[PDB]
Design a protein around this ligand. Structure first.
Ligand code: CLA
Ligand code: CLA
Ligand code: CLA
Ligand code: CLA
Ligand code: CLA
Ligand SMILES: CCCCCCCCCCCCCCCCCC(=O)OC[C@H](CO[C@@H]1O[C@H](CO)[C@H](O)[C@H](O)[C@H]1O)OC(=O)CCCCCCCCCCCCCCCCC
Ligand SMILES: CCCCCCCCCCCCCCCC(=O)OC[C@H](COP(=O)(O)OC[C@@H](O)CO)OC(=O)CCCCCCCCCCCCCCC
Ligand SMILES: CC(=O)O[C@H]1CC(C)(C)C(=C=C/C(C)=C/C=C/C(C)=C/C=C/C=C(C)/C=C/C=C(\C)C(=O)C[C@@]23O[C@]2(C)C[C@@H](O)CC3(C)C)[C@](C)(O)C1
Ligand code: KC1
Ligand SMILES: CC1=C(C#C/C(C)=C/C=C/C(C)=C/C=C/C=C(C)/C=C/C=C(C)/C=C/[C@@]23O[C@]2(C)C[C@@H](O)CC3(C)C)C(C)(C)C[C@H](O)C1
Ligand SMILES: CCCCCCCCCCCCO[C@@H]1O[C@H](CO)[C@@H](O[C@H]2O[C@H](CO)[C@@H](O)[C@H](O)[C@H]2O)[C@H](O)[C@H]1O
Ligand SMILES: CCCCCCCCCCCCO[C@@H]1O[C@H](CO)[C@@H](O[C@H]2O[C@H](CO)[C@@H](O)[C@H](O)[C@H]2O)[C@H](O)[C@H]1O
Lengths: 188, 214, 74, 173
C-alpha cells in the first residue's frame, strides 16, 4: 500500500516488486507512461544500459590514471578523462572510430530487440542472453542476488561516472587528484 | 448588483472567530488543526481555488485539494525553513559563543566576516549553486504527494512525513500529539518573524552585523 | 508555439472550442462548423494554403530586394 | 522503570528532575541510554588521553615521515591535532567510521531491544558472566564516564579561560 522508500505516499501501481532494486521509488509516476513509444519496459532497458556504461566508465577512468595507458600509447598527461581523449584522437583516430561503428552496429540491433521484446513478452529487460560462465544454471536465490548486485552497483556507478566527467572538466585534474585535494582542504 | 454574493459561501454568519471577535469565523477554520485560534482576518482559507494547480495544472485531470490543507502545508514548510535559517544565520555569526564554520579556508572568517555576505560570496564560488540542486531533489521527491491527497487517494495529514527517527510520538494519545504539533507551529511562527526581523535590520543604512543586529 | 494544442495530455487547446466561442451579435453562430469543413475536405484546405503560400512568395520577393540577404547578390 | 537499571546508583537513585525518560517512547529511552554509554567511552578515553602525554609518555620513533613525536615536548595536548598529518588523521576516522557500522548493523538494533555497541575488532565471546556481577560493572562503566564527561569539559575550559578553575589553573598544560 505504501512505498518502501517514500513511506508517506502510496506505492506506484505498476511497481510490482518483481524487478531487482524495486523499493517503490517513483514519486512522479514515470512507470505509468504509455505514450510516445516508451514505458516501464523501455525505462528499465534504459536504466540497465545506463548502469552498464557507467560501471565500465568508472573502471576505465581509474585504469589509465593508476597504471597509465595500454602498451602502444604514449605522451601521458594530467587527467585521463578528457585530456587523453582529444590527445589520442589527434594521435591515431582509427581505433576510436572503429569502435564507434562497431557500437553503432550493436545498438541498431539491440534497439530492434527492445521493440521486438515488448510486443512478445519473452525478452527480459536487460537480457541479451550473455552468460558464458553459467552463473544462472545455479541457485535461483543465488542468481536473484546477482541481479540485485548488478543494479545496486550500477546505480552507484552512475553518480560516480557523471561525477568523474564533470569534475574532470571543471578542475582539469585527475579523479584521485581531486579526492586528495578535497582531503587537504577539509583537513578538519 | 443582483447575484447572490460570494461573501456568504465563505464567511459563516452564525459564529465568530476567537481571534478578532468582531469578525465572523471563516468556514474552513475549525478547532481541529493545531495552533488554531480562528485567526484569518483576510479570509484566505476561504478562497475556492485549487492551489495544487501550481505543481500540476488543472487540465491534467479532475482533481481538487482543499485550500485550508494547502495553506497548512505551506505554513509548516515556512516554519521549518525559518527555524533552521534563523538558527543557522546566528550560529555562523558566533551568536552562541563559538563561531561555527565549516572546516576549510573558503568558509572562514577572513573570506566571509559575517553571514550577511555569505549568500553573495558563496553564490559566486558555487557552494550556493550546489545547495539549490540538493534541495531541488528533495522538493521534487516530496511535492508529488500533494497531488495524491488532491485526488482523494491518500489520508496523510499536512506536513506529515514519517520522520520520527527518535520515536518521539509512537504510542502517544491524540492529546499528546496535538500539543506537540502546536509546538511545531508556535515555535515556527515566532521563528518566521525572527528571521524577517534579522534579515531586515541588517540591510538598512545603519545596523551592524554583530549578534545583536540593532 | 508548438505547445498550444491538446493531444494526449489534458493541457492545451482544442481547435473546436476556440472557434465555437467566437460569435458576435452581427455574426450569429460565428465559427461553428468550420472544423468538419477543415477536417473532412481537402479542397477547403488548399484554398487556405495556396492563398497563404502564394501571398508568402509575394512577401518574400519584396523583402529580398530591399534587404539583400546573400553576399555579392545586390 | 528508570530506577531499576544500570546507571541508577545509591546517592541519587533515579536522577531525572525534568522528566526526560518519559519524554518519548521506550525506543526513545534506549537511544539516550546508548548515547550516554557512547558519550562515556569517548570522554573516558579523552580525559585519560589528556593526562598521559601531558606528562611526557612519548612513543619512541617517528609518527610519520618527518613529523615525528616532537608533538609532546612542547605543544599542549589540546594541540598536536593539526600537527598530526592528514593521512594520519584520516585512518583514525575511517577505523571509527567502520566501527560505527557493526554497531548499527546487528541482527536487532538496540532501540528495538537489541544489544548495545560491542567490541568491533577483537570479539571475545562476553555472554557468560554472572548477571548479578554484570549489573555492578555497568554502573561502574557509566559513573566513570559521567565523571569523565565533566572532566573533559574542565580541561577545555582551563585551556580557553585562565582562572576558570581554581585548583587546576596552577597547572602547566
Ligand atoms: C587487452 C589489452 C592489451 C594488450 C595485452 C596489449 C598489448 C600490446 N599492444 Mg595494445 N592496445 C590496447 C590494449 C592492449 N594492448 C588498447 C586498448 C589500444 C587502443 C588504444 C591499443 C593500441 C595499440 C597500438 C596502437 C599498438 C599496440 C601494441 C601492442 C603490443 C606491444 C607490446 C610492447 O611493445 O610492450 C612494450 C602488445 C602486444 C603495438 C604493437 O606493435 O602491436 C603488435 C602498437 O603499435 N596496442
Ligand atoms: C535554512 C537552512 C540553512 C541554509 C539554507 C543554510 C545555508 C548556508 N550555510 Mg548553514 N546552517 C544551518 C542552516 C542553514 N544554512 C543550520 C541550522 C546550521 C547549524 C546546525 C548551519 C551551520 C552552518 C555552518 C557551520 C556553515 C554554514 C554555511 C552555510 C553557507 C554555505 C553552505 C553550503 O553551500 O552548503 C553546504 C552544505 C551542505 C550541502 C549540507 C547538505 C544540506 C542538505 C542537502 C539539506 C537538506 C536536508 C535538510 C536538513 C532537510 C531535511 C529534509 C526535510 C524534508 C526534513 C550557506 C549560506 C557555511 C558558511 O559559509 O558560513 C558562513 C558554514 O561554514 N551553515
Ligand atoms: C580521545 C581519544 C584520543 C585521541 C584523539 C588521541 C590522539 C592522539 N594521541 Mg592519544 N591516547 C589516548 C586517547 C586518544 N589519543 C589514550 C586513551 C591513551 C592511553 C592512556 C593515549 C596515549 C597516547 C600516547 C602515549 C601518546 C598519544 C599521542 C597521540 C597523538 C598522535 C596519534 C597517536 O599515536 O595516537 C595514539 C592513540 C592511542 C594509542 C589511543 C587510542 C587507542 C584505542 C582507543 C584503543 C584503546 C587501547 C587500549 C585498549 C586502551 C588503553 C587505555 C588505558 C587502559 C591505558 C594524537 C593527537 C602521542 C603524541 O603525539 O603525543 C602528543 C603520544 O605520545 N596518546
Ligand atoms: C595494518 C595496516 C596499516 C598499514 C600498512 C599502515 C601504514 C602506514 N601508516 Mg598507519 N594506521 C593503521 C594501520 C596501518 N597503517 C591503523 C589501524 C591506525 C589507527 C587508526 C593507523 C594510524 C596511523 C597514523 C595516525 C599515521 C599512520 C601513518 C602510516 C604510514 C607511514 C608513512 C609515512 O611516514 O609517511 C610517508 C604507513 C603507510 C602515518 C601517515 O601516513 O602520515 C605520515 C600517520 O600519521 N597510521
Ligand atoms: C591491532 C590493532 C587494532 C586495530 C586496528 C583495532 C581496531 C579497532 N578497535 Mg581495538 N583493540 C586492540 C587493537 C586494535 N583494535 C587491542 C590490542 C585491544 C586490547 C584487547 C583493543 C581493544 C579495544 C576496545 C576495548 C575497543 C576497541 C575498538 C576498536 C574499533 C574502533 C576504535 C579504534 O579506532 O581503535 C583503534 C585501535 C588501536 C589504534 C589499537 C591501539 C576499531 C575497529 C572499540 C570498538 O570496538 O568500538 C565499539 C572499543 O571499544 N578496541
Ligand atoms: C526533445 C523533447 C525533450 C523531452 C521533453 C519531455 C517530453 C516527454 C513526454 C513524456 C513524459 C511524460 O509524459 O511525463 C509523465 C509524468 C506524469 O507521470 C504519469 O503520467 C501518465 C501519463 O503520461 C499518467 O497521467 C500518470 O498518472 C502520471 O503519474 O509527468 C511528470 O511527472 C513531469 C513533471 C513535470 C516537471 C517539470 C519541472 C521541470 C521539468 C523540465 C525538464 C527539462 C527537460 C526534461 C529532461
Ligand atoms: C470593418 C468593420 C468591422 O470590422 O466590424 C466588425 C463586425 C463584428 O461583428 P461581430 O461582433 O458580430 O463578430 C463576432 C464574431 O464573428 C467574431 O469572430 O463584423 C461585422 O459586423 C461585419 C460587417 C461587414 C463590414 C462592412 C464592410
Ligand atoms: C548581502 C548578501 O550577499 O546576502 C543577502 C542576500 C539577499 C537575498 C539579497 C538578502 C535578502 C533578503 C531577505 C533575507 C529578505 C527577507 C525578508 C523577510 C523575512 C521579511 C519578513 C517580513 C515579516 C513581516 C513584514 C511580518 C509582519 C507582521 C505583521 C505585519 C503583523 O501584523 C503581525 C501581527 O499581526 C499578527 C499576525 C497578529 C498578532 O499576533 C501580532 C501582530 C498584530 C503584530 C539579504 C538579507 O540582504 C542578504
Ligand atoms: C476590500 C475588499 C473587498 C474585496 C476584495 C471585494 C471583492 C469582491 N466583492 Mg465585494 N465588497 C466590499 C469589500 C470587498 N469586496 C464592501 C465594503 C462592499 C459593500 C460596498 C462590497 C460589496 C459587494 C457586492 C454587493 C458584491 C461584491 C462581490 C465581490 C466579488 C466577486 C466577484 C466575482 O468573482 O464574481 C469580489 C472579488 C460580488 C459577489 O459576491 O457576486 C458577484 C457582489 O455582488 N461586493
Ligand atoms: C531506427 C530505430 C531506432 C532508433 C534510433 C535511433 C534514433 C538511434 C539513435 C541513437 C543515438 C543518436 C545515439 C547517440 C548517442 C550519443 C552518445 C553516446 C554521445 C556520447 C558522448 C559522450 C560520452 C561525450 C561527448 C563529448 O561531448 C562531450 C560531452 C564533451 C565534448 O567536449 C567532447 C566529447 C566527445 C568528450 C529505435 C529507437 C531502436 C526504434 C527501431 O527499433 C529502430
Ligand atoms: C522522447 C522520445 C522517446 C524515444 C523512444 C522511442 C523508441 C520506441 C520506438 C517505437 O517502438 C515501437 O514499439 C512497438 C510496440 O510497442 C513496435 O511494434 C511492432 C514497433 O516495432 C516499435 O518501433
Ligand atoms: C536553555 C533555554 C531555557 C529554557 C528551559 C525550558 C525548560 C524546558 C521545560 C521542561 C519540560 C520538559 O519535560 C518534559 O515535558 C513534557 C511535556 O510537558 C513531558 O511530556 C511527557 O510527559 C507528560 C506528562 O507531564 C505527558 O503529558 C506527555 O504525553 C509526555 O510526552 C515529559 O514527561 C517531560 O520529560
Amino acid at each position: 500500500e505504501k512505498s518502501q522508500s517514500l513511506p508517506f505516499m502510496n506505492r506506484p501501481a505498476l511497481l510490482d516488486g518483481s524487478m531487482a532494486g524495486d523499493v517503490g521509488f517513483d514519486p512522479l509516476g514515470l512507470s505509468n507512461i504509455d505514450d510516445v513509444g516508451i514505458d516501464l519496459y523501455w525505462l528499465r532497458e534504459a536504466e540497465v544500459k545506463h548502469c552498464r556504461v557507467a560501471m565500465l566508465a568508472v573502471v576505465g577512468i581509474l585504469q589509465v590514471e593508476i597504471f597509465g595507458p595500454a602498451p602502444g600509447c604514449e605522451m601521458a598527461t594530467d587527467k585521463c578523462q578528457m585530456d587523453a581523449f582529444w590527445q589520442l584522437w589527434g594521435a591515431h583516430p582509427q581505433y576510436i572510430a572503429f569502435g564507434l561503428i562497431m557500437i553503432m552496429m550493436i545498438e541498431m540491433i539491440s534497439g530492434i530487440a527492445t521493440t521486438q521484446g515488448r510486443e512478445s513478452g519473452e525478452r527480459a529487460p536487460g537480457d541479451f542472453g550473455l552468460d558464458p560462465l553459467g552463473y544462472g544454471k545455479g541457485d535461483a536465490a543465488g542468481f536473484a542476488r546477482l541481479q540485485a548486485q548488478e543494479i545496486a552497483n550500477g546505480r552507484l556507478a552512475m553518480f560516480a561516472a557523471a561525477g568523474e566527467i564533470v569534475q574532470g572538466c571543471t578542475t582539469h585534474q585527475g579523479a584521485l587528484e581531486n579526492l586528495m585535494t578535497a582531503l587537504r582542504d577539509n583537513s578538519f | 448588483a443582483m447575484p447572490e454574493r460570494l461573501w456568504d459561501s465563505m464567511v459563516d454568519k452564525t459564529q465568530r472567530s476567537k481571534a478578532v471577535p468582531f469578525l465572523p469565523r471563516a468556514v474552513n477554520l475549525d478547532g481541529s488543526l493545531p495552533g488554531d485560534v480562528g485567526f484569518d482576518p483576510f479570509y484566505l482559507s476561504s478562497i475556492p481555488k485549487d492551489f495544487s494547480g501550481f505543481i500540476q495544472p488543472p487540465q491534467w485531470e479532475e482533481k481538487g485539494i482543499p485550500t485550508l490543507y494547502w495553506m497548512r502545508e505551506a505554513e509548516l514548510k515556512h516554519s521549518r525553513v525559518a527555524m533552521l535559517a534563523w538558527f543557522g544565520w546566528l550560529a555562523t555569526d558566533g551568536a552562541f559563543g563559538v563561531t561555527l564554520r565549516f572546516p576549510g579556508e573558503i568558509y572562514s572568517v577572513e573570506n566571509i566576516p559575517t553571514a550577511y555576505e555569505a549568500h553573495n560570496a558563496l553564490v559566486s564560488q558555487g557552494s550556493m549553486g550546489f545547495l539549490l540542486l540538493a534541495v531541488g531533489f528533495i522538493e521534487f521527491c516530496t511535492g508529488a504527494v500533494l497531488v495524491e491527497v488532491a485526488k482523494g487517494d491518500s489520508d496523510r495529514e499536512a506536513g506529515d512525513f514519517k520522520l520520527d527517527p527518535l520515536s518521539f510520538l509512537k504510542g502517544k494519545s491524540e492529546e499528546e500529539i496535538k500539543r506537540m504539533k502546536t509546538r511545531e507551529i508556535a515555535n515556527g511562527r515566532l521563528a518566521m518573524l525572527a528571521f524577517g526581523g534579522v534579515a531586515t535590520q541588517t540591510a538598512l543604512e545603519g545596523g551592524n552585523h554583530a549578534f545583536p543586529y540593532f | 508555439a508548438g505547445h498550444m494544442y491538446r493531444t494526449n495530455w489534458g493541457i492545451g487547446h482544442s481547435m473546436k472550442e476556440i472557434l465555437e466561442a467566437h460569435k458576435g451579435p452581427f455574426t450569429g453562430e460565428g465559427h461553428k462548423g468550420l472544423y468538419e469543413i477543415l477536417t473532412t475536405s481537402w479542397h477547403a484546405q488548399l484554398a487556405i494554403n495556396l492563398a497563404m503560400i502564394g501571398s508568402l512568395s509575394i512577401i518574400v520577393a519584396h523583402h529580398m530586394y530591399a534587404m539583400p540577404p546573400y553576399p555579392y547578390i545586390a | 522503570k528508570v530506577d531499576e537499571m544500570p546507571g541508577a546508583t545509591a546517592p541519587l537513585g533515579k536522577f531525572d528532575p525534568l522528566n526526560l525518560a518519559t519524554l518519548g517512547s521506550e525506543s526513545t529511552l534506549a537511544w539516550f541510554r546508548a548515547a550516554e554509554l557512547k558519550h562515556s567511552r569517548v570522554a573516558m578515553l579523552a580525559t585519560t588521553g589528556y593526562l598521559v602525554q601531558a606528562a611526557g609518555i612519548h612513543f619512541p620513533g617517528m609518527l610519520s615521515s618527518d613529523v615525528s613525536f616532537e608533538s609532546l615536548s612542547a605543544m599542549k595536548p589540546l594541540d598536536a591535532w593539526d600537527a598530526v598529518p592528514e593521512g594520519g588523521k584520516n585512518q583514525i576516522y575511517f577505523t571509527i567510521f567502520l566501527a560505527e557500522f557493526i554497531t548499527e548493523c546487528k541482527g536487532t538494533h538496540y532501540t528495538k531491544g537489541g544489544p548495545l555497541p560491542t567490541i568491533v575488532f577483537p570479539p571475545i565471546d562476553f555472554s557468560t558472566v554472572n548477571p548479578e556481577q554484570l549489573k555492578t560493572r555497568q554502573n561502574r562503566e557509566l559513573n566513570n564516564g559521567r565523571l569523565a564527561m565533566i572532566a573533559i569539559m574542565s580541561f577545555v575550559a582551563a585551556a580557553n579561560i585562565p582562572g576558570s578553575v581554581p585548583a587546576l589553573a596552577g597547572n602547566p598544560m
